[PDB]
Symmetry: D5
């Protein structure tokens, strides 16, 4: 396939998602008729469609405005970028922060877009490992920088709730490239800097 | 209309859930054939059964080992009891803590039991307002005490993600009974204590 | 006039806002031609249009889903709702948090919509005093509750920057109604509860 | 092309700004006749002139009272210097702190002066990367020292509001020179000190 | 039977304890010949004795130096007294702190001793409800003041471990005597000084 | 003897433990006839069986679903995993956190299970040191990774109660395998992301 | 004599102060010939003129733009307004914060100016107490409000240096006018929102 | 006997203490001849006459500068005043903080002076319950206020080390007079106002 | 002379100290006859033999249980060990915390025992620089490790009160051995690992 | 001229200071007959003397007891020494803290004295650059160790007030001697112990 599905297709799956969600309510042993549940099959459906929109977006139309500042060549960092994704294993959320650092080469992407790349890839059914590696890469390919480093710390409800309610159970997953990858003195500066 | 769906009543729909989910994924724009979504409809099917595993429980039996202390009549408080529940509108987790306090008459409920109570009502498609009241009731009922006062604070994922990504939006819901309802110097004492 | 202007009208004022913003760049003593400034007249214009969208929205189409829970009648609170508005005196931002509390009567509005009312009124050219009073009112009229209380603490850049750079210079502006207005014991519970 | 626009050069456009703003408001959907927007185009006109009041200043004269200490050559550091600047793309404030450190050769700049430097470059339509470098330069230049190292951390309102309301998104930008650039055990010392 | 059991009985109860713990080790499915548990019966025996030495002490022999300053008739407080105890239900540590607040009448108890009255009552198989009230009274007896107010906060390990990991769930109890019981301005004013 | 001892061995040893404790209550100088310790032996016994169930679980057994990701070769870490456990020397709880880190080879382990491995070993008569090296290994061997890094910190109740009262007395213990051990860089960078 | 002393009186007294200081440097046993104190008198003199410029400003003068809002009758507060000042007893800085609160009548004062009133009085040889009652009044009289509440906390350098070294020694001083004074409720609720 | 004992007496005192220590250095188990102890009986000799200098000092020569400001009649608070005393029971330190609050009438004492007063009594062989009443007292006589409010808090070293080794163990002692004593709404506003 | 001095000697010591205090109570300016001082020479008498009990204790009867675990050879850290000593220079307390780190070889000492060792030297007339070396020492001899790493931190009461009244004034003292001494990459990882 | 100027010159320089300050008062446009400034010349005179008493002291008379422990050759640290000083440029307080780290050789300086070397150098008209280096050297001289490392952090009031309110702007300086200068592992390890 490939191509990102827009509002048209999403506008049609509503009834089937609605129904998929109606069938569920009954199976949990619930009475779909309560005043509450009443319009849930649509809301839920309608909602699920949101935590998964990164699908109908492409890193190209999202790109653009990658200012050719060049004149700098020194570690830019955008920390604490908020992220809310969907565990692809049990359709449950895992939410956290993302930090990014790079060694611009000739180009330097606007800051407003780095928080965007994070959204194109987070609003999908993901695994943390991959969301990370995907952001880093998009950044590289688009900016062609000397080195990119992405570290993602997030809490998963799959843990925090089912199985065993272990709050804190924060998992961090990094992906270093180039200078960050090769040179540890740099990678060291990155980490010991995303703290404060 | 009664009947706490049991093991076979669970095992009978699991495959039904599995299906409605296998649907959803397709209706989502994904491909249930990848490695991650191969086993999801079950992982999910099963997950969701967990978060609504409070339906099959009864306060009656859940009760007991409720010591006839009596000779105290001096406010007992169990705070920071962690809670995890499901929004019944979009079916998105909402998490927080529940605090509870009372004035033992002739009975003083086993400590652990207070958290068990909190657990039967949260593991259900809920609404914070109601979830707060039910707990508070079950205690009034199962302990016929001088006064009850339950306060729940939990952060919603419905808000925090979709709509208007507002974290920090902690919605607090109180519910007082008896002495707590009437005597406000008792109520005013409770709140200033469920803090430090 | 009255009626809220949508994307059509906004789609036409772009060139005049663009130009209004081009004329400015030159007047600040800047060379509109730099690689940077180059597409700013459109971005800025495009942006200004965002911090002011609460105009094209109406508290009616935004309302709906004001669940008739009724059965409760005890202080609901949604604290820490983030807010980012525009000083109507010098077109500079003032950003902060909003807290809301009420005594539901027969109806109880979904939580997802309270954070919404805040947005319909904050994305406009405002004064803090008014943004506050407007939220409170919308809530009242829509929910017909026993009492509503809104407190808004925000920092203004007009201060924090020009004039005299006084960080912290946080201003709080409250608006109590009904029970909150009349009864101070209640209003007391509210405030001493939006803290923690 | 040189010439730090002065008083008359300011007073000549103020009315021009006032107009372009009186426009904007109308082009916005507002009514410049209300009481608040009556005097805005000036308040704004004037405000904006303030935030770009660094154009009319020169590091040359701004310099001086730069003591010929010399006999130290041991790292001096002025941190937490508060900064306030303007995004040159959407023209939305971005605020933070700038930290600076060096190794006095034969000259040691007056303390206050370091902050004055920081002030000439921030009060302009800027871009954080550049704003960081300029400061660092002006110091290398005006002090011909062994090594300079400037680090700016500031939160952007462009992000924080529009696009994807991400607060906490603090983007840090470093820029080292001389010993700092080369000697990393000096650079590594700086960063671990601009903290506590 | 009363009468304290000392190290002559605390040496005449050990080998029995060693035996029982030695039995436990096996009934638990371990090998009591392992390096680790080689002398564990003796240790856990000796430990158990320690945790329950409070029995072998008489408040009266704990007292003595109960100075007759008399002149003060103003609230004294001894906060954050560390308290380690043994849940008599499962014999599992519940730990916390105590806060004491009396109103001197004719004698002020030597401060260091308000800490002893604690170890006499906590070092025994207990219930929080009682650990509390006991400490109050004891004081009341040994001083004959105008009012005594005791609040204890403890986190029972039976919960934080068995039952299924519920940390935080701190439990707070209070036994007000005299003024504190009656004069509320006093009780409350007490509870606002035990927080900072 | 080996062979996982299931709920069967236990269902018979319980009444032994129950009797063993009965012994202890009297040996402690208490009365097994009070309403309190009247059933204590069965609670205590039963409780002891819980804190030592890791015995009845086989690592291998719990694995199953070690998704074959391979594609990463970038450190995955899971901090703040809670852990409660027993001291084999005196049989007193010892609790704290466990943070694990590893360098996926061809296989990556589902994060949910990375936390189960900890409970199969924490639920036994342990010694931090051992408890540590065990998780380390059980993981090397389950994922055949380029490297494992495991660190635990916990407060032993033995110290913080008996013996002395020396609280805070947290004890940390590392155990790096593979690269974490070899390459001293990866080991240090682990150690930093586990602070954050 | 009164009459606001402008930059004129000062432009002549400076060389007096400058000479006065010259006196002091030598009286201190120092040398006014070192490179340091070589120009100190003119810096010191000049500096002293700055810390006492509130003299040359008239409240009335700074007002002008007390927007006629009226429409509110709901407490507006402005906390954390910074303030630096001089001790008239020893002429040593004393610094801290100022938090103001009032109940708008027909007029509401632009928040920017609510902070200027503080600098016209903080910039003089003051005594906290006085400095306080002054802002209070200058505000009653400028907005003719239902009530004013003003509170200041600051560390006097006299104590924290000379005399002793007693640091922290922050001193607070209230001064309620109108309702804040009368109605003891509004006064208390002020006092709480200024903590938050 | 009264009448202050100055240096002329402390001098004649230094060798009877010096010996009193060369005796307790020996009767200790130590060999008072070493390098470290060679001078302890005199070092410690002068240190004791130190912690007890508050004796030879009268608040008649200490008061003075009891400024006749008056026209304030609004509460004045001097918190976090550092205080360090001796346990007259065991000659063991016990350091802390003194907060003082009063209502001016016809006189307002200079703040510098409020600290000097806490010292005159804080430097003696004292009793916390006592050290207070005096400090509060001196003030009603030396200023004839409307009512004083002193509250002290300190950690006694007699329990922290010997006894049971309990830290944190803060003991708050208060003494209210005039309005503070009689009018609670004041007393209260006082306490809550010294926690900031 | 060596050989420990027990109770039989401390007893014969209690009256030569008691007098040594009834002399320093008098030669102080106080009247040792009161109610409070009536017993200070004996209360304080036994308190001194207390803070100096570490003398009559040998680590031969203190060690024991030097468990032959071995198979760990991974760093073991026991931080925040509470320690309280006496300034042999002035007989003034000085409380703090001791952190100990070592590399097991063929033996791992039980943690409970690590604290008991800090006490044997911590309870004597000491020197911080000294109290360390010994604690670190005992360990290389009592465990023949790969290298110890002790670091102590405490606030001496000799400066805090007498001298200049300086709080916070922490004095950290360290002593590295074996690997710790020689191998920095370890020494380091040690320090950074005890700050958590 | 050298030779310290004492209270015989400190009484022979007062009336001159009183006069000059009395002159300042007038040149400042105030009335020296006001109750407040009635005796202000004398006070500010006396104060000034205090702030500059460091001149009248000789390091050599400050020393003495410089114990010869010799045996340690391990880093000692005296952190957070409170420091109040006088900017010789405008004679305006700059305040902060000091951290000292030496490597004992043959003698350890009596701790309390490392605080004195401070007050001798800070209590004078100073520059931070120098206050620092001086304290280093001084130590170096009076001890002849292997390395001395001094870092001072101060917030100059000339900035935080004059120039236009720039708080935070803390300034940090460091003078490394011996090992610290050379052996970096030492310098850095120093700077990581002066943070926690
Ligand atoms: Zn998951
Ligand atoms: Zn929802
Ligand atoms: Zn504004
Ligand atoms: Zn921007
Ligand atoms: Zn229990
Ligand atoms: Zn143990
Ligand atoms: Zn003063
Ligand atoms: Zn004592
Ligand atoms: Zn000392
Ligand atoms: Zn200066």
């Amino acid at each position: 396939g490939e191509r990102p599905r827009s509002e048209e297709d999403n506008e049609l799956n509503l009834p089937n998602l609605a129904a998929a969600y109606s069938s569920i309510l009954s199976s949990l042993g619930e009475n779909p008729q309560r005043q509450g549940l009443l319009k849930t099959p649509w809301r839920a459906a309608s909602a699920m469609q949101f935590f998964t929109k990164g699908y109908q977006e492409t890193i190209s139309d999202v790109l653009n405005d990658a200012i050719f500042d060049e004149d700098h060549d020194e570690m830019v960092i955008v920390k604490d970028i908020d992220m809310f994704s969907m565990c692809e294993h049990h359709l449950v959320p895992f939410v956290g922060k993302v930090h990014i650092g790079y060694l611009p080469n000739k180009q330097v992407l606007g800051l407003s877009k780095l928080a965007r790349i994070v959204e194109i890839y987070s609003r999908r059914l993901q695994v943390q490992e991959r969301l990370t590696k995907q952001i880093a890469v998009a950044i590289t390919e688009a900016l062609r920088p000397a080195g990119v480093g992405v570290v993602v710390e997030a809490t998963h409800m799959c843990m925090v709730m089912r199985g065993v309610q272990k709050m804190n159970s924060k998992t961090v997953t990094s992906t270093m490239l180039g200078v960050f990858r090769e040179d540890p003195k740099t990678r060291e500066e990155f980490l010991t800097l995303i703290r404060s």
